[PDB]
Amino acid sequence: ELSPVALRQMSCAAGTTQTACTDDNALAYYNNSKGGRFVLALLSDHQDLKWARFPKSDGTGTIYTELEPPCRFVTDTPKGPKVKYLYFIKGLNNLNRGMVLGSLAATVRLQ
Amino acid sequence: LSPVALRQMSCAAGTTQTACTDDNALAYYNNSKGGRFVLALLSDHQDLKWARFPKSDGTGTIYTELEPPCRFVTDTPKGPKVKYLYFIKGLNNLNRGMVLGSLAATVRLQ
Structure with missing residues (x-):
């Protein structure tokens, strides 16, 4: 009983389809684990x-x-409230959903 | 399930109910239905x-x-320190993630 495991953020492309994936649409949550970057969710x-x-x-x-399918939530920013969408990756187990x-x-300050 | 603010408060803790003194620990909690839902202690x-x-x-x-607690290390300005993370009995894994x-x-997690 001792506890590692860091949660990093890169930017990344995303879209309604694969070829629609364009230009850093989003923020990916990931871990370095195993044989490369392991992605947990997108913002x-x-x-x-x-x-x-x-x-x-x-x-x-x-x-x-x-x-x-995404979560709707609302954050307080210096530019006022912005509505964002959180996408868990298909089949994320709950521990990892919990980390995000x-x-x-x-x-992040939430309405 | 969308995100809920998770707050911190000071609280008493102990080996037994009676031994819960002044404030030993820092609890992580949610608000919900008025009931503060406590998730873990530090x-x-x-x-x-x-x-x-x-x-x-x-x-x-x-x-x-x-x-039973998890040992972990935070690094403070006077070097590394060992703290113990206590989940609440029966905390599901989702809330374990949250904590x-x-x-x-x-926490400065070294």
């Missing part, structure tokens, strides 16, 4: 996303990870 | 089994049983 202004795309640094090619929700809620 | 202390929480109506007080993700944000 976006956009409400209609189905995929996220991650070119591998390998150079093999690209990963598309399917998104779950808890980090948001700890760092 | 303590320097190694040997805790119970936390105590006076309901703020002064109707009474709640003792919630703690799980762990809030720990990373609120």
Whole structure:
């Protein structure tokens, strides 16, 4: 009983389809774990996303990870309230869903 | 399930209900239905089994049983320190995640 495990954020492309994945639509939550970047969830202004795309640094090619239907929530910002959408990755177990929700809620002021 | 603010308060804890003194620990909680839902405790202390929480109506007080703690290290300015994370008995994994993700944000986790 001792407890590791860091939660990082890169920006990334996302879209309603795979070829629609464009231009850093979003913020991906991830872990470094195992054989590369392991993505937990996406944060976006956009409400209609189905995929996220991650070119591998390998150079093999690209990963598309399917998104779950999003949560609506509202944050207080210096520019007033902004509505964002949180997308868990298809089949995220609950511990990992809990990590994302808890980090948001700890760092971001919510209406 | 959308995110809920997770707050921190000071609280008493101990090896037994009676031994819950002045404030030993820091509890992580939600508000909900008026009931503060306590999720976990943080303590320097190694040997805790119970936390105590006076309901703020002064109707009474709640003792919630703690799980066996996790050791972890935060680094403070006087070097690394060992603290213990106590989930509440029966906390589901979702809320375990929440606590762990809030720990990373609120505590210098070395």
